Amino acid sequence: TLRDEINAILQKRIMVLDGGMGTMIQREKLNEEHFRGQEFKDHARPLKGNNDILSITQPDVIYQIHKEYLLAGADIIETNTFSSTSIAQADYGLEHLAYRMNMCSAGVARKAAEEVTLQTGIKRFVAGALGPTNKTLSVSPSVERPDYRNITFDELVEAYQEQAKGLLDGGVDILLIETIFDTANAKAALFALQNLFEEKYAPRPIFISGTIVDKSGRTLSGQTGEGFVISVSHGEPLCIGLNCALGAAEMRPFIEIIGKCTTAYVLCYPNAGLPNTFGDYDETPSMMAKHLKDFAMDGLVNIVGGCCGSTPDHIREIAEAVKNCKPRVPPATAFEGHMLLSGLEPFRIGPYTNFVNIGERCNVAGSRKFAKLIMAGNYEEALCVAKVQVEMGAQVLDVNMDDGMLDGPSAMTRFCNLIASEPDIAKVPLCIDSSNFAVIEAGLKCCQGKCIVNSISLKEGEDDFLEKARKIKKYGAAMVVMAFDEEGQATETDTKIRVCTRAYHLLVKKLGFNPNDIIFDPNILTIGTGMEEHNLYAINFIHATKVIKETLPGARISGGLSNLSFSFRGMEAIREAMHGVFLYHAIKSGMDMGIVNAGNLPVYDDIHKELLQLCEDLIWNKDPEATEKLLRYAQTQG
Ligand SMILES: CN1c2c(O)nc(N)nc2NC[C@@H]1CNc1ccc(C(=O)N[C@@H](CCC(=O)O)C(=O)O)cc1
């Protein structure tokens, strides 16, 4: 296929990509009549500056620019479709034509590519460019309305799907999500591409390239390079990298950092230096070629090119410079065994990582303060609960909005949108927890990074679980699988192990799920309720954690720690004591993380020795009278 053909070329030599199409169009200096052409002569809105309309109004100019770039030495030419969505064309009144413009841009690029391929013998490729659009999902249009968004995930999915329909019907060889200002927009474009590839169309290679705005190393939406790579690698792009907004000397460290984090190829086409006082990126082609050759000799990049300021002279110099350079070899074992989560910053859970705290207090059903703030509509002050959780040591935040008084999806969308507006909250990943899958989808469609979906299970059959898991994989997030099946909630050790194994072998063998993205919850259940059947639950969880960790490769283990101490509510210190003891024994068992009260977990050594012994007796059922003894000990604290 096309992906194999491109991958074969990328292994032997470095590939050169198009260049500054807008810069070439600027030297043409077309006027309003030239932009309109004959067909749009009486169009009610101005079309000057709309470079995408030239594909139907001035095909000759676009074709000549493509031929110039290809004869310069470029191997891949982007289509003139940077603003060819219905949303981007809404400024020009050309919403209905987004399919037509994409089709004609693909055709006019393909004719030039075929002509140059015939004339030179070197096969050329056409990359369908999908622009970032002026609308942002992860950033509010106004400072005073942080939770407000003027565009939704579904609208952008529809627009990008129409654009990609136009591009694929025109016959592009590569799809290129470029100049990503918002990682959520890139995820929406990937979602649309997955819809198209799973409905009718054979897959095409996908090139993803972000944009580091400043020397701070973060995109426009605030995500770092590693976080961006983690977020957008669920679609498995053939190439990843950066473009524009920076010169090579300013882009080199970020390119190295990205190259060391992904097993995909690295594409880098930066601006031709900094703009001068006149506004022209004046870095000469020779200096650009030398900078890209320094990039290539170090093994930093695999695809080179130029963003704004790159004329075909720059492309000729770059192509002749990188002609003899040896390509980058991707690291095949990039963070093997780790679980790769992300918010604004990467969060990797490896085999030698400590216990990961997940903040339980952002739960409507299980936090009195959070529920009190949410039902009043005061999400602004309910964000302070997550702030305190992160300040207190929570590495992941668990979000739950399940209540009959609340509209689930709307509340979860608003809370995720408000979370994204706060930097220190947004750097840690989120845990999407809800019994309704609509709320889970609403949470996944508002997240910038890679989150965890909580509470998926075999409760409603194999087919429903499989469909939900397929949707989660398409969204590309991590997911927790409960030990819950058609017979009910798992309580015995053997039943927990059987349910977890059955869930695991479905996901990996049939759905092809990533084993490092699966988290198993053997259902920590309350003990010491006064009922003798409930006294073995902690032991069952610990043994199930043992067997699951030593029999299911790559699968993590988590659970709700506070569930174990429901019988002793109001007696907080004893609850923290059992939490410490159970955490000690479960981490010795293999519990990788858990939804826990982040700052209220004492270490096993500073627990009071008498209370330590009482909690050990209760949890391990060493004494049939343990629960009443612990209650009496609590009563002695009067
Ligand atoms: C049900 N349990 C759970 C689970 O067992 N397994 C998974 N995967 N996910 C989850 N998510 C929800 C839940 C864990 N979260 C919890 C569990 C318990 C509490 C809790 O004890 N809250 C206190 C009040 C909290 C307060 O106001 O301070 C209470 O009185 O009940 C608070 C949060």
Provide CB contacts within 8 A for 98, sequence distance 6+: 84, 85, 86, 89, 159, 162, 163, 166
How far apart, in Å, are the Cα atoms of 434 and each of 401, 439, 446, 596? 7, 6, 15, 17
Q: Where are the domains of the chain?
A: 2-21+66-321, 353-601
Kindly report the number of other CB atoms within 10 A of residue 461's CB atom.
11
Provide CB contacts within 8 A for 181, sequence distance 6+: 132, 136, 211, 219, 220, 221
The answer to the question of whether 91 is labelled as a binding residue is: no
| Bridge partners, residue 305, by sequence | 17
The answer to the question of whether 454 is labelled as a binding residue is: yes
Amino acid symbol at 353? T
Phi, psi of 488, deg, nearest 5: 125, -175
The answer to the question of whether 239 is labelled as a binding residue is: no
Q: Which DSSP letter does residue 561 get? A: G
Give the whole-angstrom CA distance, residue 365 versus residue 371.
7
Nearest to 296 by CA among 305, 283, 308, 285: 305
Residue nearest to atom 15 of ligand 1 (CA): 360
Kindly report the number of other CB atoms within 10 A of residue 491's CB atom.
17
CA of residue 390 to ligand 1 center, whole Å: 17
Residue nearest to atom 10 of ligand 1 (CA): 560
Give the whole-angstrom CA distance, residue 69 versus residue 112.
10
Nearest to 610 by CA among 577, 584, 583: 577
| Bridge partners, residue 348, by sequence | 340
Nearest to 491 by CA among 457, 525, 462: 525
Give the whole-angstrom CA distance, residue 290 versus residue 296.
10
Give the whole-angstrom CA distance, residue 7 versus residue 13.
10
Q: Which experimental technique did the depositors report for determining this structure? A: cryo-EM
Residue 200 beta carbon below 6 angstroms from any ligand 1 atom: no
Residue 562 beta carbon below 6 angstroms from any ligand 1 atom: yes
Residue 64 beta carbon below 6 angstroms from any ligand 1 atom: no
Give the whole-angstrom CA distance, residue 334 versus residue 316.
34
Residue 302: both structure tokens together: 């695999």
Phi, psi of 268, deg, nearest 5: -140, 115
Give the whole-angstrom CA distance, residue 107 versus residue 56.
10
| Bridge partners, residue 240, by sequence | 208, 266
CA pseudo-torsion sign 346, 349, 353, 356: positive
Phi, psi of 126, deg, nearest 5: -115, 125
Give the whole-angstrom CA distance, residue 248 versus residue 307.
11
Residue nearest to atom 2 of ligand 1 (CA): 560
Residue 398: both structure tokens together: 């668990």
Phi, psi of 345, deg, nearest 5: -135, 155
Chain centroid to CA 248: how far? 26
Residue 601: both structure tokens together: 């977990």
Instruction: Report the SS3 class of residue 185.
Output: helix
CA of residue 622 to ligand 1 center, whole Å: 26
Residue nearest to atom 21 of ligand 1 (CA): 562
Instruction: Report the SS3 class of residue 399.
Output: strand
Architecture category of domain 2-21+66-321 in CATH = Alpha-Beta Barrel (3.20)
How far apart, in Å, are the Cα atoms of 601 and each of 251, 340, 614, 638? 43, 25, 17, 23
Give the whole-angstrom CA distance, residue 426 versus residue 497.
35
DSSP H or E stretch at residue 318: helix 312-321
The answer to the question of whether 563 is labelled as a binding residue is: yes
| Bridge partners, residue 521, by sequence | 482
Kindly report the number of other CB atoms within 10 A of residue 550's CB atom.
10
Amino acid symbol at 475? Y
CA of residue 557 to ligand 1 center, whole Å: 17
Whole-number CA gyration radius for the chain: 28
Q: Which DSSP letter does residue 343 get? A: S
Residue 421 beta carbon below 6 angstroms from any ligand 1 atom: no
**Given this chain, do its domains 2-21+66-321 and 353-601 carry the same CATH topology?**
yes
Nearest to 107 by CA among 69, 55, 61: 55
**CATH superfamily assigned to domain 353-601:** Dihydropteroate synthase-like (3.20.20.20)
Do residues 520 and 556 lie in contact, with contact meaning Cβ atoms separated by under 8 Å? yes
Residue 521 beta carbon below 6 angstroms from any ligand 1 atom: yes
For this experimental structure, what is the resolution in angstroms? 2.8
The answer to the question of whether 464 is labelled as a binding residue is: no
- Which of the listed residues 360, 484, 557 should we mutate to test ligand 1's pocket, taking the one with most ligand atoms within 8 A of CB? 360
Strands (E) in 170-249, as ranges, are 174-180, 206-210, 239-243
- Helix axis angle for 572-589 and 609-620, nearest 10°, is 60
Strands (E) in 439-587, as ranges, are 452-456, 478-482, 484-485, 488-489, 518-521, 556-557
Instruction: Report the SS3 class of residue 319.
Output: helix
How far apart, in Å, are the Cα atoms of 596 and each of 167, 394, 397, 520? 48, 8, 10, 15
Kindly report the number of other CB atoms within 10 A of residue 249's CB atom.
15
- Which of the listed residues 521, 595, 601 should we mutate to test ligand 1's pocket, taking the one with most ligand atoms within 8 A of CB? 595
Closest-lying ligand 1 atom to the alpha carbon of residue 569: 30
Amino acid symbol at 613? Q
CA of residue 567 to ligand 1 center, whole Å: 13
Residue 529: both structure tokens together: 């309720």
Amino acid symbol at 201? Y
How far apart, in Å, are the Cα atoms of 585 and each of 432, 520, 538, 588? 27, 17, 10, 5
Nearest to 161 by CA among 237, 99, 68: 99
Residue nearest to atom 12 of ligand 1 (CA): 560
Provide CB contacts within 8 A for 498, sequence distance 6+: none
Q: How far apart are the first and last CA of the chain?
A: 76
